[PDB]
């Protein structure tokens, strides 16, 4: 520490690269996403850390896979946040 540093107003990601409950306001580090690949032609919305298999109603019947954190998607783009 330079022992005089500001703490009222932090840098956009040089003082918001910190742990999420050590920030001034607590934010998640997760997001939603609007998908719609071909294997299942429907506008699905899915959480980033899936935690469970997300099913498909088309020819496919799998979209995700829950790993140790985020979730590995598949061969279908479909991406957004949106906003959060």
């Amino acid at each position: 520490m330079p022992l005089a540093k500001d703490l009222l107003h932090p840098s956009p990601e040089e003082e918001k690269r910190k742990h999420k409950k050590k920030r001034l306001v607590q934010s998640p580090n997760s997001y939603f996403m609007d998908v719609k690949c071909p294997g299942c032609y429907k506008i699905t919305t899915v959480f980033s850390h899936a935690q469970t298999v997300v099913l498909c109603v088309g020819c496919s019947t799998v979209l995700c896979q829950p790993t140790g954190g985020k979730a590995r998607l598949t061969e279908g783009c479909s991406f957004r946040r949106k906003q959060h």
Partner: protein
């Protein structure tokens, strides 16, 4: 059908295929899904020669 919008940029050709009755929408397909949200997750080590 030009998905790139490049073929008809010349103002001389903009009206070349306009119908005399105004193009009706009864056979027009409207995509309701916002394709701006679909990102192909390239698990990004794909490479090409310099």
């Amino acid at each position: 059908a030009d998905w790139t919008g490049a073929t008809y940029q010349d103002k001389r050709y903009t009206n070349k295929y306009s119908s005399q009755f105004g193009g009706g929408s009864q056979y027009a397909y409207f995509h309701e899904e916002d394709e701006t949200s679909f990102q192909l997750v390239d698990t990004a080590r794909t490479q090409k020669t310099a």
